[PDB]
Amino acid sequence: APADRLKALVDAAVQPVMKANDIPGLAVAISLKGEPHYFSYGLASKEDGRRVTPETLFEIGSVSKTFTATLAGYALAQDKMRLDDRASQHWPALQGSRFDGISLLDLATYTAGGLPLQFPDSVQKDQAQIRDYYRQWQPTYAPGSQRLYSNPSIGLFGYLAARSLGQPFERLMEQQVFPALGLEQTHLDVPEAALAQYAQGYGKDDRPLRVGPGPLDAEGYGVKTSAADLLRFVDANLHPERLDRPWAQALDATHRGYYKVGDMTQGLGWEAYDWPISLKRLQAGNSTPMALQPHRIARLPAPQALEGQRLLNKTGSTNGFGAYVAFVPGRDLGLVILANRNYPNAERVKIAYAILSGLE
Ligand SMILES: *[B]([O])([O])[C]([C]N1[C]=C(C([O])=O)N=N1)[N]C(=O)[C]C1=[C][C]=[C]S1
Secondary structure (H helix, E strand, O other): OHHHHHHHHHHHHHHHHHHHOOOOEEEEEEEEOOEEEEEEEEEEEOOOOEEOOOOOEEEOHHHHHHHHHHHHHHHHHOOOOOOOOEHHHHOHHHOOOHHHHOEHHHHHOOOOOOOOOOOOOOOOOOHHHHHHHHHHOOOOOOOOOEEOOOHHHHHHHHHHHHHHOOOOHHHHHHHHHHHHOOOOOEEOOOOHHHHHHEOOOEOHHHOEOOOOOOOOHHHHHOOEEOHHHHHHHHHHHHOHHHOOHHHHHHHHOOOEEEEEEOOEEEOOOOEEEEOOOOHHHHHHHOOHHHHHOOEEOEEEEEEEEOOOOEEEEEEEEOOOOEEEEEEEHHHOEEEEEEEOEOOOHHHHHHHHHHHHHHHO
8 A cells, every 4th residue: 555655646746747748758766764766757768669767867957066066065074175265266277367256155156246057158168268268257246145046156166176176077076976975877978888778858849959068067967867876865965974974074065055045045056945835935946037037145144054844956957858856854855856858847846846745
């Protein structure tokens, strides 16, 4: 009966949203009081009929920012950087630029002063072009005043965290972070031997879409993972104390809130809400205006622990994929929803809320 009831709950949440948003394939993974549960739907590739499983690789887009935040958490744990460091401390090319007056915390939490959502199309994936973009950039408004969600912002945060550790970002993630977290199905660059697991992404007219190269792609949106591996990452977040101490500290650093915008408290990578909260408020925190428009922050007098009666979440997208992760620290509950269509955040939150409400 319990297995029947959980399947009925997850099917009732997922099936209508997959039909309504024409989602070819979707993987759910749930962590419930220390037990994993998997529900897999539809096709990883329509053309060859390959089914989604909990081992199918999906692009998770901006959920990658929580991995980037974890690497920065490790640099913080090792005293290689501080959040109040000036950004230019960690990259001499930026000495004498406006990054002399911008903190690593501003970059991490999108408050550097108007760095845009994406790099402009004029900046290709090229070390010199990225360098020259930051050297010339000037804030629209005072650092630490307005949140404008931004890949160049947290991307530079991750880049500088890697520089503080003396190695390239992608190398540190592959050689140190993923192994420390027990993740063998999590990739920035999918190996040839794993390509058979890589789902197809679908856009307009079902155009096939896998993510192409871009500046600081690894830091902003580069992770491909399975539902089973992303749930292992959620379980690490629910129990940092089970990891070796420097990695436990790295994860704890991603559970600290610095300011509020509306109902949302901004951490490193993770975004948090009081729990319970209405579905409409959770959708509004994850809305298009929250992602695209500047918002004045309400700064906390001290960093706030993102634990207890809270939901921590992150949306992530690419042109072909739509991911959502949410967990409730004080209930030992975690959820992953990975799909191969970029379907609206409101609909991802609708699935998650139905499941989390039904487990509670
Ligand atoms: B991340 O998912 O927040 C980020 C930016 N983004 C896209 C969306 C969306 O479409 O709803 N919301 N936020 N993702 C990326 O920059 C990766 C992309 C690669 C190609 C298109 S988006």
